[PDB]
Design a protein around this ligand. Structure first.
Ligand code: TQF
Ligand code: TQF
Lengths: 223, 229
């Protein structure tokens, strides 16, 4: 895992991308819940293809997915919605705007944060290569502060360090100056703080109404 | 936005608020911590108004940024004060608590466990003071910028330019310390990913404060201290 080149890390992450799933006012939360449940399975198979992930124990793989899964669903939604300003593309047959999110209490606040994240992506001209790097960072970093355990944390940080090398490489070969490379790297990672914030408020909203996937479910999906 | 990296560091170190003291029983613990945080918030306002570029914003946006960031800023200051005291949080020099004293309140030890892990991460990275004040200023400018008109557009462009000047400042600090370009990028990323956990901590932290209940500084109170005459 730690021997891959920057170009090979990108190629591995791109090839590992999950498919875009389809949907099957009151029934809206039923559709969105069922869509997320089916996405999670493909998320598990994506995670196993993130270089270095399967080197961790099963127990540590599950905990990483427990802490990261909602963030990953969200950043994928934000990416899907990037070229659809003012709307969220949950699925190709489920394109919702801000108005349809007002039906549920506490819903449009998260809707607006997702819309603003997608606009932020738009005006940074986020590239697919960068997006898959960002998604893998969320997987490895979201649970690292909440765990042999020293070796696992060291391994996680080594892989996080190579993704950083990979993001700098993509920026460098795009023509960015060294100053622009540091600045863009920081800009992308500060967005990860807003995604974590979005995921926290999203979880609170979910709990205000089977909220999280169980440890046994995640473990079984890992196979 | 005209400062050099050294002038940025120098200004941020000069803006650093003082370390305050608590004014022992677990029953009075929340009263002491609440009073301490309330007094820290006054000095936080003064500190924020000295962070370069912050006063260029409208008072309205200044209030909004502090509304979104004040808990994060209190928490990172706590973690910084606790860095050299493993397994303990130094709320004040006369108020140093361990994990067993955080068990008295439901849901306290979980957030407490999170703060201890961040303190240990600061130790593991040998976080420097110059890096710490840069992180704190990034928290101020970044946490509320994604949740704000033409004025609003000009504000976010200015905030991102100041955030860019701080990123340059972090890199210059590591470059002066002999780290390679690779090590500079990697440490930059490691420091900024901690901000995700600090936002996470402040989020459960806000949940725990509402679970107890004057939970948050009000908009009018923040505006009053910011809007000086
Ligand atoms: C055991 C796990 N199951 C229990 C289920 O929890 C769910 C239930 C529903 C969602 C959807 C969903 C679906 C697919 C997607 O790609 C993304 C999302 C995004 C989002 C934010 C989270 N969501 C919403 O409706 C929403 C709410 C308020 C404001 C805006 C959007 C995700 C997870 C999953
Ligand atoms: C109106 C504004 N008021 C101020 C608000 O109330 C309070 C009351 C108390 C705290 C302390 C406090 C004080 C000083 C510090 O530097 C840091 C902190 C940190 C922390 C997490 C936040 N806190 C706790 O006790 C705690 C809780 C659960 C787990 C661990 C620690 C902050 C704010 C309401």
């Amino acid at each position: 895992a730690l021997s891959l080149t920057a170009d090979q890390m990108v190629s591995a992450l791109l090839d590992a991308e999950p498919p875009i799933l389809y949907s099957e006012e009151a029934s809206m939360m039923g559709l969105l819940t069922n869509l997320a449940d089916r996405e999670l399975v493909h998320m598990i198979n994506w995670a196993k293809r993130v270089p270095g992930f399967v080197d961790l124990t099963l127990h540590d793989q599950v905990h990483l997915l427990e802490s990261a899964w909602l963030e990953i669903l969200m950043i994928g939604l934000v990416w899907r919605s990037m070229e659809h300003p003012g709307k969220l593309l949950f699925a190709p047959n489920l394109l919702l705007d801000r108005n349809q999110g007002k039906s549920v209490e506490g819903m449009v606040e998260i809707f607006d944060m997702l819309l603003a994240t997608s606009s932020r992506f738009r005006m940074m001209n986020l590239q697919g290569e960068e997006f898959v790097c960002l998604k893998s960072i969320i997987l490895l970093n979201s649970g690292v502060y909440t765990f042999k355990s020293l070796e696992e944390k060291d391994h996680i940080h080594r892989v996080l360090d190579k993704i950083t090398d990979t993001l700098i490489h993509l920026m460098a070969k795009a023509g960015l100056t060294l100053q622009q490379q540091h600045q863009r790297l920081a800009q992308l990672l500060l967005i990860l703080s807003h995604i974590r914030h979005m995921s926290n408020k999203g979880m609170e909203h979910l709990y205000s109404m089977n909220v999280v996937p169980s440890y046994d479910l995640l473990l079984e999906m890992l196979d």
